[PDB]
């Protein structure tokens with residue numbers, strides 16, 4: 001080699017200053033991993049090269065990485081790995097790259113493919129909805145002649161080295177090397193690696209309205225597997241790559257593409273438009289405003305900046321969204337610790353308004369639109385044969401709902417077959433199915449939010465308040481709060497409405513999403529004899545007043561009456577169940593029932 | 595170790611690991627997929643009439659109390 | 674054969690373990706005589722076909 005190797009070596013003296021700040025980093029990450037492994041009685045080989053250390057002072061070496069990314073990366077690895085041993089060889093796995101930074105206009109939205117940069121560096125974002133299997137793969141197996149005690153060596157190359165199209169080895173395992181010895185193979189010293197494909201859709205808001213979402217796929221490696229839950233705003237970066245013989249491997253080859261698009265990439269990141277690290281400053285201010293004894297009320301009014309009133313509804317949403325705990329019974333069935341509120345109202349009274357903006361601040365809680373095909377909580381045994389001999393129970397809609405919220409619409413405008421499914425997932429946290437395959441109890445922590453409409457217009461007052469939708473009481477008994485939104489007409493009421501819609505055709509949100517997601521990590525009190533003494537008195541008088549009046553209540557309603565106040569103390573961020581929480585819990589039900 | 599497992603056994607197996615070749619349609623498909631299994635070595639199963647049990651049959655005979663203590667015995671978790 | 678058929682010399686061989694199983698003869702006298710040899714007699718007379726070579730005896 002002298003021409004193709006010279007600017008390697010000139011870089012081999014160049015980039016060693018481009019890890020003046022990382023040559024500490026790459027050895028500090030292993031010296032304790034070498035230490036703790038010797039005193040057990042763990043991290044991969046990630047070497048994040050920024051742009052900044054390779055753009056401030058190298059230009060010929062720079063643009064080679066963004067024009068021809070095929071003669072440069074295995075140079076960068078081979079010159080990396082000697083520094084692993086030249087730093088660390090006394091105690092007795094190739095350290096590939098990641099390359100974070102910016103890029104300067106390669107945010108190819110994959111609705112667009114490129115004519116300029118094929119076989120180059122690409123930055124891609126979107127959502128994944130495939131999540132295929134996991135399967136290991138060999139790279140190097142070592143053979144051993146059991147007679148004469150001598151060893152052997154063999155490496156298999158594949159379409160996995162990411163860059164060099166070597167002569168493949170169309171072989172699985174050889175036998176009988178040039179001797180009369182029956183070949184033995186040591187599998188502890190044979191190395192493996194995994195292999196997982198995933199398809200990425202289009203972020204369906206920035207693709208303009210002329211098409212359905214498109215998709216491509218990406219092969220990643222072990223370092224960031226099981227990181228990709230289906231429904232994450234992911235952002236990957238890798239090389240663009242074609243493989244496969246198009247036009248010769250079969251004869252006459254008419255109308256068959258033979259150039260599959262692939263991405264053999266690295267370093268995914270979740271984004272947000274779970275990881276939000278805050279400093280000492282904002283963590284102290286949120287304690288400083290915690291000292292105020294009004295902030296439960298301020299958060300109610302600072303949520304929906306368009307609509308008047310409904311402060312009973314507005315406190316309920318933030319009470320539900322933050323969530324109440326479920327303490328599992330030891331060697332016993334745990335109870336309902338989910339909360340599940342419901343609405344109904346005569347039309348155009350903002351029943352669906354506030355239902356869509358809970359999805360923006362959802363904190364990884366992606367909901368459906370309530371279109372009630374069978375698949376709302378199940379699998380329907382969709383396997384697609386998974387490359388000839390693998391059957392997979394593909395996750396329909398509960399792998400996204402776990403420790404999150406959902407919302408569905410149009411209950412009475414549904415068939416029967418969804419209603420039997422919402423029976424099971426409410427009485428029990430899990431679904432278990434055996435369609436043409438395996439019985440499997442997979443767990444789910446869900447919390448529905450409902451929206452239906454009454455049937456006969458404005459007939460609520462002149463008839464019974466109950467049966468007003470007459471969907472089965474299997475769900476009404478499994479739900480707690482049936483807010484009936486009024487629309488009464490008062491000349492000061494509507495006049496106030498008329499300007500407030502008009503004033504908006506022309507205490508903050510990201511602080512709000514931090515406060516709740518910090519409050520999911522604080523301890524749960526549950527324990528004060530004072531607060532439990534007053535609520536049962538508060539129950540008994542309405543236990544005299546439920547049956548001689550509107551609506552009969554049951555024992556599970558008491559498990560609400562702990563749970564609302566339990567979450568109400570989670571707003572307080574304290575470990576003492578106070579007295580003041582028990583007054584808002586009683587008063588909220590009093591409007592919900594009267 | 596055969597004939598010693600059951601559907602529904604909350605158990606654990608200890609055993610040794612090896613992958614296996616596929617030897618079918620290995621060129622077009624089946625490039626270097628592996629589809630391993632594990633090979634078993636040991637099973638440590640868990641949570642399983644006048645034969646050293648008569649002492650507790652006497653505890654009902656000596657104490658008596660059929661109509662009420664046994665009534666409080668099954669399902670004492672209601673009102 | 675050429676092209677990287679031989680490997681590096683590994684310090685972990687098998688002949689050093691082969692003779693170390695030869696000193697798994699009658700020598701373990703802590704646990705009525707050689708106890709793992711006592712189980713060897715209750716198989717040859719054909720009533721049970723599973724020896725147990727644990728790590729406790731190692």
Ligand SMILES: Nc1ncnc2c1ncn2[C@@H]1O[C@H](COP(=O)(O)OP(=O)(O)OP(=O)(O)O)[C@@H](O)[C@H]1O
Nearest residue numbers: 306307308346347348349350351352353453497501
């Ligand atoms: N009670 C209300 N107060 C203030 N604005 C309202 C109210 N109801 C509706 N609006 C205005 O009307 C617009 C749309 O209301 P929306 O379509 O959500 O009614 P809805 O809840 O969907 O009723 P339905 O589900 O029966 O159609 C919103 O932009 C909102 O500003």
